[PDB]
């Protein structure tokens, strides 16, 4: 059965951007999905995404523009200390100058760059580059 609504959404994105489709439909939607997508726009990896209300869990239509390489989740959402981030970024990101490790903390869903800026830590949630 469906165990991770985030993992299913990111899988549809990867299977759409390797194929070259410029859009993808995500079902179902969640605030973790919507906030994970917002981090992508701030770094430009996607265009606008459209949330469709159906009086249910929802549906999301995303616009892909091909400057993304791979986005995925890390299961489970491991506990990540501040000193742990250096290990995690090395093994997940292709280089030290680009790529993002998305963390969920009590300060919100955010990438490892601004996570180091405000010096708080939480669960690792995914990666994007």
């Amino acid at each position: 059965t469906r165990t991770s609504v985030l993992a299913d959404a990111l899988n549809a994105i990867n299977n759409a951007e390797k194929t070259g489709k410029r859009q993808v439909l995500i079902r179902p939607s969640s605030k973790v999905i919507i906030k994970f997508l917002t981090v992508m726009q701030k770094h430009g990896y996607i265009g606008e995404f459209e949330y469709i209300d159906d009086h249910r869990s929802g549906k999301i239509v995303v616009q892909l523009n091909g400057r993304l390489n791979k986005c995925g989740v890390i299961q489970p959402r491991f506990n990540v200390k501040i000193n742990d981030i250096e290990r995690w970024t090395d093994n997940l990101l292709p280089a030290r100058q680009f790529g993002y490790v998305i963390l969920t903390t009590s300060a919100g869903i955010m990438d490892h760059e601004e996570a180091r800026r405000k010096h708080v830590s939480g669960k690792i949630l995914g990666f994007v580059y």
């Binding site: 070259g20 489709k21 859009q23 439909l25 459209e50 469709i52 159906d54 549906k59």
Partner: protein, 81 residues
Amino acid sequence: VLVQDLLHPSPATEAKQHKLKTLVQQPRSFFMDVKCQGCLNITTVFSHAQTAVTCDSCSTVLCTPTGGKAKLTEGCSFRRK
């Protein structure tokens, strides 16, 4: 196709696509006002009615249940609401 308008699909493909697979699910079933041949009395009947609905005024069965849409008896006219 690489670029498609997912948010506004043409209604032509919406009419042929399954009700749960459309952008937002919507019943294709409806409600009818059935005029029996015996008398004129508004009786609201579901299209996919499972029960042999009879008129209130006259003891005449309006529809006989079928696997899908119920078939109204001869002399029964329906108007969609």
